[PDB]
Amino acid sequence: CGVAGWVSFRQDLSHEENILAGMTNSMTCRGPDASGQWLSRHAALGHRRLSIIDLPGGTQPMTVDTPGGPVTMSYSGETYNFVELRDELRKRGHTFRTRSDTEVVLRGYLEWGAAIAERMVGMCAIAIWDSRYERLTLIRDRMGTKPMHYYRTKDGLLFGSEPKAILAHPDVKPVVDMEGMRQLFSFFTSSENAVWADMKVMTPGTVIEFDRNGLREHTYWQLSAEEHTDDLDTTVARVRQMVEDNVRHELVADVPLGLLLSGGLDSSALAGIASRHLTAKGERARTFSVPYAKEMAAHIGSEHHDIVLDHRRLSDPDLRRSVVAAWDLPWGMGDINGSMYLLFKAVREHVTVALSGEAADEIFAGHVWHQSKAARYGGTFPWHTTWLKRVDCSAYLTGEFNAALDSETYTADRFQEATARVPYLDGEDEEQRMYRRSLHLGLNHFMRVLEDRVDRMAMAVGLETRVPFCDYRLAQYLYNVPWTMQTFDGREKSLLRASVTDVVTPDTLYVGALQEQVKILLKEPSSPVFDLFDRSKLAEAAELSPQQIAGAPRAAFEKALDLAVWFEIRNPELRY
C-alpha cells in the first residue's frame, strides 16, 4: 500500500483534493488496485491500496464515527495478530463490519490510543487523524520494514510512504543540502535525514503525534539488554518455534502467495517451513529464483520458476530510470537494485504476496563483518571495514565536493551516535560486548537500508514482500543470546542451521555497457553530474577495458548514471 496526507492549523484542507491526489497518486505503483481520499478542515488523508486481505472491505482511508467526531486512518502493512486482537476487542465491545486487519488496527486505536503500536505484530506505516483531539498519529513498525517520511510546514505537517508523496506538494521545493548529500554518499547507514532538505525518515518502533502544540515522538520499542537463561538445546528449539510461528502467520492472504528461494540457508529455511504449512491447505508452494535453489524446489515439491537475467537487461537505461524513480534518490547500486526489480517484476506476474528471508543474516550474525574480529573491534561500522575500501568512489569526485562532503568525519560522528545507542548488560566481557555492538549496528543501520530497498523495488511493481526473520521478538531474543551459542558449530547462522536441519537438505559485459552509457554522458559536459564527479577521471575510467575497471570506478559509474537520471526526473536544487 501507499499512505500520504497533509495536516494544517493555518489553511482549510476541506477542498484540497487535487493536491492530496498529486501526493497519493505519485505512489500508484505501491497500490495499483484502488485509491481513496478523506478531506477535513485540519487534515487530508490519501491512500494507494494493494488488496491482500479482504478486497471489498479493506477500503482506505477507513473512518470510524465516534461521539467526538470521525477517526480516519491510512495504513500500509500487515498486522499478523489481527485475529487475536479482534477477539480481544470483541470482548471489550467492538463490532466489525469488515474481515480486514485495517479495521482491527483502527478500532485498536479507539481502545488503546497510540499504544496499539505495542500490541500489533508485523510490518506497518500508519497515519491516524483523531478529530476528537484534532491530533495526527504516525506509527512505524519496530524493525522498519514499512517506510514513513514527514516534512514540517508552518503550523502543519506533510507525510508519505515515499519522498515523492511529499515532493508532489506545491509548497515543497526539491532541495538537497550538504547534510543530504553526505547521507546520499553514505554507505548502508540509517539516518533521520531523508537526503531531501527538511524531510525526515520515521525511526523504527516510534509513534509521532502532531496537533496545535507541535510534534511529539515516543519510542514504544527498542532492543534491550536482558539475561539469557535458556541453554543451547532450548535456544535452538525456541528459534525454530519463533521462525515457524512467524512463517505460519505471514502465509495468511486472500491472494496468490509465493516464496523467494536463493539457495542460501535463509531462503531454504523459510521455503521448507512454508511448504509444510501451505500443504495444510493442499496449496502447492510457488518458489522463484534469479544451484542449491533448484535442489530445494524438488525437496518441497514446489511450482519452481527460473528467472533468467542477461547483462543487456540489467544494463538497460530504462531499468535504471524505473529503479531511481522508485528510490527517489541516486544510490548507485544498479546491479543489486535492477536485479531484484526484474526479480520482483517476474514474481508479480504469478503472485501478489512473496516471503523473503532478508533479515536472517542481520539477526543470525551471518555476514563476514559479524565474524571478522578486525571489523567488530574497528572504530567505524563493521561493513565499512570489509567492503567500503573497494566501493569508495570518493577518488572519482571533484576535490571541491569531496572536501565539502567530509565523509570520514560524517561516518565517525554517525558511528559515535550509533555505538552510544547500543544497550549493554553490566559486567559483560569484551567478546560479548563487541558481539552486541556488531548485531545492534547491523539491525539499526544496515538492515534498515535493505528493508527500504526490498520495499521500494517490490512496491515499484506492486508486490507485497514479507520478512518472517525481520521480527522484533526474534531480534530481541537473539540479541541477548551469548556469542558462544550463535557460532556453536564454528560457522555463521549455527542457531539457524541447527533449527532447520529436518526441512533443509544439503559480469564483464555489464561493465562495458556502464562505460558506453558513461561515454554518452561525457559527450554533454554541461550535465550537473560533473559538479560532483570529475569529468577527466570518468573519461579516463570509461576509456579502460571493462576487465581493468573494478570496485571504485564501477561504483563511480553506477553513481554518475543514477545522478544523470535523478537530475532529469526530480530536478533537485543542490545547495552546493
Side-chain angles (χ1 to χ4, degrees), residues 1-9 11-15 17-38 40 42-49 52-64 66-75 77-83 85-87 89-90 92-109 111-120 122-153 155-172 174-178 180-189 191 193-215 217 219-226 228-237 239-240 242-243 246-260 262-264 266 268-269 271-272 274 277-278 280 282 285 287-288 291-293 295-299 301-307 311 313-321 323-342 344-372 374-388 391-420 422-430 432-452 454-482 485-486 488 490-491 493-495 497-503 506-515 517-518 521-522 524-525 528-534 536-539 541-542 544-570 572 574-576:
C1 319
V3 172
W6 176 20
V7 173
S8 182
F9 302 96
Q11 296 166 231
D12 193 345
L13 311 181
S14 297
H15 298 294
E17 299 95 341
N18 295 344
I19 289 172
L20 181 65
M23 300 180 63
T24 312
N25 294 326
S26 73
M27 307 176 292
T28 287
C29 57
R30 293 192 70 81
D33 295 342
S35 62
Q37 282 188 332
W38 182 90
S40 77
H42 298 301
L45 297 197
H47 188 263
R48 293 303 321 199
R49 189 157 160 250
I52 312 297
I53 306 270
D54 187 357
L55 265 64
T59 308
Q60 294 189 49
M62 194 173 287
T63 311
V64 288
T66 72
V71 182
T72 311
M73 181 180 72
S74 193
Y75 165 43
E78 293 293 352
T79 308
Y80 303 133
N81 60 332
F82 82 98
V83 174
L85 284 167
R86 177 144 71 204
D87 293 327
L89 283 163
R90 274 164 177 168
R92 292 155 179 263
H94 289 269
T95 52
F96 294 88
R97 300 181 160 180
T98 69
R99 45 174 295 278
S100 75
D101 63 351
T102 309
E103 191 172 17
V104 178
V105 173
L106 182 49
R107 299 204 177 281
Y109 171 81
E111 186 63 19
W112 298 295
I116 186 53
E118 304 152 11
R119 287 185 187 260
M120 277 186 294
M123 55 178 175
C124 72
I126 295 157
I128 295 171
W129 173 257
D130 197 337
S131 288
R132 302 179 290 173
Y133 308 110
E134 292 188 347
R135 187 228 295 167
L136 174 78
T137 305
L138 295 168
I139 312 179
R140 184 169 189 192
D141 62 76
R142 294 175 183 80
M143 300 302 269
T145 306
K146 278 287 150 289
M148 184 62 87
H149 306 73
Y150 61 89
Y151 183 104
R152 281 273 216 162
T153 78
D155 294 306
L157 191 75
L158 299 163
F159 47 96
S161 278
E162 300 179 347
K164 56 178 66 70
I166 291 164
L167 289 168
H169 200 271
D171 290 325
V172 173
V175 174
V176 175
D177 55 27
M178 274 303 299
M181 297 299 285
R182 275 161 204 160
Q183 182 54 35
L184 187 65
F185 280 88
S186 78
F187 161 71
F188 279 95
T189 56
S191 185
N193 171 37
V195 182
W196 303 105
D198 302 306
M199 192 196 293
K200 300 284 143 53
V201 188
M202 267 203 73
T203 295
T206 67
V207 176
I208 290 171
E209 301 179 352
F210 185 69
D211 54 46
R212 295 184 154 273
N213 300 329
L215 192 146
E217 182 173 357
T219 304
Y220 74 84
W221 182 94
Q222 71 182 11
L223 285 166
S224 68
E226 303 292 344
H228 182 72
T229 53
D230 296 4
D231 64 337
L232 180 56
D233 289 2
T234 307
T235 309
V236 167
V239 162
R240 173 50 173 259
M242 296 181 89
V243 169
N246 286 351
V247 166
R248 187 165 44 99
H249 289 133
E250 292 181 15
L251 286 161
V252 175
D254 292 12
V255 290
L257 180 139
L259 307 165
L260 300 184
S262 54
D266 313 327
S268 295
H277 281 125
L278 278 178
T287 50
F288 302 88
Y292 298 88
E295 190 196 49
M296 189 60 199
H299 193 87
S302 53
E303 186 188 352
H304 195 75
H305 294 278
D306 287 308
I307 305 144
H311 75 96
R313 215 54 42 239
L314 295 177
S315 67
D316 203 328
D318 292 308
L319 179 57
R320 176 165 274 113
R321 293 186 102 91
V323 161
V324 171
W327 254 125
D328 274 312
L329 291 164
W331 293 107
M333 23 166 55
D335 198 334
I336 64 176
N337 269 7
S339 61
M340 71 154 44
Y341 182 97
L342 290 179
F344 295 152
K345 181 167 181 169
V347 168
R348 185 63 189 82
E349 291 179 5
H350 300 266
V351 293
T352 308
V353 182
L355 268 64
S356 173
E358 261 290 326
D361 283 305
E362 287 83 70
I363 62 169
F364 289 113
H367 293 289
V368 299
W369 45 264
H370 284 296
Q371 309 293 258
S372 173
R376 284 182 289 165
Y377 288 61
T380 196
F381 296 100
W383 54 91
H384 290 226
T385 317
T386 58
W387 301 332
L388 182 61
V391 177
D392 200 343
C393 59
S394 56
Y396 295 94
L397 296 172
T398 58
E400 184 162 42
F401 173 68
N402 189 39
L405 271 179
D406 202 344
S407 293
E408 193 160 23
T409 300
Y410 183 88
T411 300
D413 287 0
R414 292 297 90 77
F415 180 67
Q416 190 197 327
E417 293 173 4
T419 53
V422 177
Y424 305 89
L425 215 54
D426 287 14
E428 286 188 315
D429 63 57
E430 200 183 3
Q432 186 62 29
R433 280 188 289 101
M434 293 305 99
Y435 156 71
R436 279 195 189 282
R437 197 168 82 185
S438 182
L439 207 77
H440 200 270
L441 294 169
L443 292 166
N444 286 293
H445 288 281
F446 193 78
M447 197 191 71
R448 290 200 192 164
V449 167
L450 293 182
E451 277 176 297
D452 223 333
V454 167
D455 178 79
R456 292 296 168 86
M457 298 305 94
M459 288 291 151
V461 316
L463 179 64
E464 170 166 284
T465 43
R466 296 187 174 167
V467 280
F469 296 114
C470 202
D471 190 73
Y472 80 92
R473 299 162 290 181
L474 182 58
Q476 177 66 38
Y477 185 73
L478 281 163
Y479 180 62
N480 295 318
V481 173
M485 293 192 188
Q486 275 275 31
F488 87 93
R491 267 187 298 168
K493 307 177 280 189
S494 291
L495 293 172
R497 183 173 34 266
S499 55
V500 176
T501 177
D502 61 337
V503 297
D507 211 339
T508 303
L509 293 163
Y510 173 72
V511 185
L514 293 182
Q515 286 175 303
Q517 288 170 21
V518 164
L521 178 64
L522 287 159
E524 214 62 74
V529 173
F530 303 120
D531 302 359
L532 307 179
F533 277 80
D534 208 61
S536 188
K537 292 181 179 175
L538 281 175
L544 295 176
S545 84
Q547 308 94 51
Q548 277 175 286
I549 287 291
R554 191 225 191 94
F557 297 151
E558 300 236 59
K559 199 66 164 166
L561 290 169
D562 275 46
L563 280 159
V565 162
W566 182 52
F567 279 121
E568 192 165 32
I569 63 168
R570 292 296 173 276
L574 300 185
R575 298 286 195 248
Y576 161 77

